[PDB]
Amino acid sequence: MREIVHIQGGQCGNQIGAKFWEVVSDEHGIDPTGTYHGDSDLQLERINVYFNEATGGRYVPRAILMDLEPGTMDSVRSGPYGQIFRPDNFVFGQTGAGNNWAKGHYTEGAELIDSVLDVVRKEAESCDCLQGFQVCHSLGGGTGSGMGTLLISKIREEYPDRMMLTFSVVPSPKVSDTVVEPYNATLSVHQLVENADECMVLDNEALYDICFRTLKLTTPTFGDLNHLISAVMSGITCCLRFPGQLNADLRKLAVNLIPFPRLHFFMVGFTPLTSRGSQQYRALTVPELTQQMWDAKNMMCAADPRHGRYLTASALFRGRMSTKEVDEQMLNVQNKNSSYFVEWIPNNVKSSVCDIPPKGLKMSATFIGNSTAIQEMFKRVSEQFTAMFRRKAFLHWYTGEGMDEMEFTEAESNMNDLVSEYQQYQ
Amino acid sequence: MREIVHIQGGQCGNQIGAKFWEVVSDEHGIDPTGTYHGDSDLQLERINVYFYVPRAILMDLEPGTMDSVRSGPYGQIFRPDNFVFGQTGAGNNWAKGHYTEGAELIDSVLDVVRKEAESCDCLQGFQVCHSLGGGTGSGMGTLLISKIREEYPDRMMLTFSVVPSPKVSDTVVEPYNATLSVHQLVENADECMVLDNEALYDICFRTLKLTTPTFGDLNHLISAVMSGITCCLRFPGQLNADLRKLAVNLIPFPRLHFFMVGFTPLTSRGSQQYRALTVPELTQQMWDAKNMMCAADPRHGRYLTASALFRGRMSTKEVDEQMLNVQNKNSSYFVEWIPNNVKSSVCDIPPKGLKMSATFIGNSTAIQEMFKRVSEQFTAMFRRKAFLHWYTGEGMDEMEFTEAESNMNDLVSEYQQYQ
Amino acid sequence: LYYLLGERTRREHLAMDMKVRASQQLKKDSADDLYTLTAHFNEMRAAKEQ
Amino acid sequence: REVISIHIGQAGIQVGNACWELYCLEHGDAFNTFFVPRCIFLDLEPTVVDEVRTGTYRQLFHPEQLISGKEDAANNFARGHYTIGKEIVDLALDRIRKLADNCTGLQGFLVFNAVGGGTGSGLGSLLLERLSVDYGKKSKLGFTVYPSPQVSTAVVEPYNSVLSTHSLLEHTDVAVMLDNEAIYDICRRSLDIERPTYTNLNRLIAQVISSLTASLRFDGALNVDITEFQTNLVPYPRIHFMLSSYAPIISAEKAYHEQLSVAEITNAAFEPASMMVKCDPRHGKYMACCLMYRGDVVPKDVNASVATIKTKRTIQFVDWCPTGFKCGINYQPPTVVPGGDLAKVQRAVCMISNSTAIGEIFSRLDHKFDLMYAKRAFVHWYVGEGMEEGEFSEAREDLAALEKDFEEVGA
Ligand SMILES: Nc1nc2c(ncn2[C@@H]2O[C@H](COP(=O)(O)OP(=O)(O)OP(=O)(O)O)[C@@H](O)[C@H]2O)c(=O)[nH]1
Ligand SMILES: Nc1nc2c(ncn2[C@@H]2O[C@H](COP(=O)(O)OP(=O)(O)OP(=O)(O)O)[C@@H](O)[C@H]2O)c(=O)[nH]1
Ligand SMILES: Nc1nc2c(ncn2[C@@H]2O[C@H](COP(=O)(O)OP(=O)(O)O)[C@@H](O)[C@H]2O)c(=O)[nH]1
Ligand SMILES: Nc1nc2c(ncn2[C@@H]2O[C@H](COP(=O)(O)OP(=O)(O)O)[C@@H](O)[C@H]2O)c(=O)[nH]1
């Protein structure tokens, strides 16, 4: 019935989804060949939301990998659970954009977007009742940010009635890989505020913090970071896939968390995440799950919400849980730290429970908090953007491609009025 | 009971027909030695339609094609008396292949086909595989069509004809042959299924994703089409539709008998197990414009009529909502003064290797583009009489090319008129 | 004198070649414009039939 | 499916000494089209013929087939046409008749001659005249050697070339031009033989001949017989002179390093630096091309290569012919000769096209002929042999008509 299609853009997007399809297919008990081998029938009744039966027990994931470099796609197909994607969905250029938002939005976008749109159209009309779309990309690169954002714009002109998620990492000053990060972040966000339904902001700085303190990994490569991100993303859309005592679908969660149409950048967390050293020394009860959820040091963004105020918040619980204990524990953490919560909305937290924990655990949680501290990030990025544009550094690699100076003034103006209006609602 | 006689002309026709009898003999379970080894008894009941020695007549003007026929497998199954065969060779000269060399081979090919026709009781029709670019294939095959209609006027007649395209151009005198061949086809053949190598190479690039599509696979694709179109005779179905019923459902006007063809399912070896086999999925591959086997995009015009022959255990209900959906969705691409422009048919026996197959036959009005695409090249060459003396010094005069021009010109006019 | 006449003629012939190359670009993209624009005409045609 | 080959003059039979060495080596039913060979060497000087009689192929050739006269033609068209030809030509054609009688499905004759000499010009034209009377309808493939502009071994060769071409118009049906200076440049540039002789030239001429007859000897994916060149390449009855080229003419060292495929060799067959005639096809406009493919070649890439050629603009095509190609694919790879200077190749291409650059060659020859003739230099030798003053001027005006024909058709 309700259906979600998957879209992965750029190199970062391709690896995130690869670990995602491995984890989900594991949850449904499908082996890397693509055949059903599950035990109960709780798993079989809701595999139409993500997969399609092909022939004689063959289930193919409904995903589309889209990028511009051959190596990135090849790596997903070499590894396990790479042999499960349908080869038609490997929409793929040949030249390359290379961290140029202009090349990703005007030069190479204009000749690849039509083809990936055809795959998206076929994948959308292959199902009956759309629930929404799911896009993973970055905001620093060019082939993921600019191309992916134009993909978002094309969809809003095609399907304006359906939902839309975008999982986007943002560049930080402390974790700053490339040099054209501000010229990409400002224009990408500019297009995100006018096209995306809701955006769930991520960043690499917070990812490094979690992997040192809580996870205590020795060599945290990208496989494990994507392991965290995939477990969190599965937690959002568990409610469409499994029955629970209190169901909260995506559109239900969106209308509960977005008080104003422009205020749709969310901060995330996940529980429980422990080292294998301290796994044996704690229990699994609702208090241990809630304190690790609402910890500011456990958030999956580098924006301390304790530097602002929570507008609304949501928690999606998984496992055989009692809703009485759910709201009383949620109410307790909302009453003590009352100053961090907005005043003119009582009970700022929407909550839901699902009865199927992930494999290997008895109880997990996922936090999605629409805070106001995100204005710090836009200031922290916009000042770097303004610093370069005042004396035109790197300007000609975009200007000589088709953008003018008025496009940058537009991008800064929209960020400026957004930060001003976030500060107003603060 | 109902009988189909096969006739293969020219080098192109012979190699297509060689692959055709390979596939049919495989379906009927007859070994390359000529003895039955099949499993089901449904195949024995309707094997007289094609047979165990095949009921075919190969005809050409160069021994290489005949030698290459008996060399390969399923070459020991033809009756050596049916290898009616000249010796000199026309060689890409329509006048030679239609007046000079035909005038002495045609009497012998007519004798063998007449013996092969009266050998059975009730003919359904004839089935001719040939080209429109070469000389000994097009011209001789064309004259054979005219001679047959004089002797057998009430019998059906199929012509699987490939046409030249400027993107895939073999010889230099291609338009001189294509224009004249059409001039005879428009008044002689009952219906023609237009093919061309450009669309075939394009299919093997995108859908089949083959690296080196030699002539074996192209002839394999055309063969699958010809096996699919006559499945209704050879096997019972939940709704039968023989050759005659397709013609009367598809041809609204007596000069509109040039069809475009497609086939489903066609998938690469890599994506072979990653796919499903459902009626809606086959319909999206049927009505795709990049799946027609002509270089005439049907979405540049309107459809007049269309048909889909299905094979396999199917539910007729699914057939009807898919056909009505495709008609109600894209209502501009279909003609307005005929409601329910789609004819359908079901047969219970799939081709060997598949569970569910389909064959599309679309009578569109986008065909006038390719015919104008041809008349352009012909017009320029004829104006300064290029290459004309190799035809004129044989009996052909100038008014013949003008007559073929007029027939080419007024055909595309009435396609535009009915558009 | 002839050694330099040759250089001026070579310059003139190259000035024509880079022009010929630019002319092919105009030919190609204009063909693309016809395909996209006739699609626009069909869409408006479809709109009025409905 | 049989074709007989006659060889005229010192140049014709030396070329034949390479052709038949290649044929017998290649065939070690397919041999029926050539095999005793179906040949007649004929010459007016017995020195080169007796080289064949005492050579290694003493037993291969039937003794009568080797025709040899008693005295030379003295590099005089007139002497080799009216004085000495009259005695040898009757014996030659009395042999060709019963060789054709032994055959059943004769495709045609193919002749080898050089137009600069006396025998190749004089009795070569005479033999072609009487064959046209006797058969007429059968194709005659004329592979001539015209004299080069700057490289020359004779003095009066303009006289012979004009006087030979005048009959070469209405007698041969297919005529292939091969200069010597151009092939010298080919063997120097691509084969890197700095000191070539006639033997190397004659070896790669045989490679070209074998490539265009391989469609008869062996079955291919797309066969093309001797009647196809007759039709697909001759747009008008008076324009039959074809540029030839072959690829890859590569030395052993270079070939292994190079990746030979259809697209690049189809390109290499169209540059003027690899043609068998010193002429500039850029100066002309192509009428129709014919592409012979041998070896591992599928129809896709030959069609892909021909598409890239038609879209390039350094070479232009005529307006009266949009589809100006006739391709042909054969399975058998080209054979090699031990001692030959070519390496084994997976696939080779022979191009035979028609353009108006040839129209430039005839004007260049006419000027040299015109200069000497006005003051009647060297005319008295031919007149004493039996000719007169009339036929020089009338042959001159015949070439003038041909120049006008090329300028008009190219318009
Ligand atoms: N007593 C009791 N109340 C329940 C139970 N489940 C849900 N509710 C109540 O239902 C209220 C919200 O309405 P729901 O029934 O959950 O949702 P809905 O009415 O279908 O509306 P939608 O969410 O838009 O589908 C909450 O206030 C809960 O108190 C239950 O199992 N027992
Ligand atoms: N390619 C090639 N050309 C040759 C060869 N021998 C002579 N020629 C050419 O032949 C022309 C000179 O005329 P010849 O062939 O020698 O005259 P001929 O055929 O012997 O006639 P006569 O000498 O009068 O008996 C020049 O163009 C020579 O380059 C050869 O072995 N190979
Ligand atoms: N979490 C995570 N981040 C990644 C991964 N690969 C790349 N990144 C981030 O992506 C940023 C650069 O984006 P890039 O890959 O060039 O984007 P694209 O080229 O447009 O597809 C860097 O700051 C990395 O931190 C990954 O596997 N996991
Ligand atoms: N599909 C297909 N087409 C072929 C084949 N062989 C030749 N052709 C086409 O036929 C045309 C040449 O026809 P030809 O065989 O010379 O006809 P003929 O000389 O009269 O026998 C070319 O344009 C080819 O594209 C084949 O095996 N399959």
UniProtKB/TrEMBL annotation, chain C:
<protein>
    <submittedName>
        <fullName>Uncharacterized protein</fullName>
    </submittedName>
</protein>
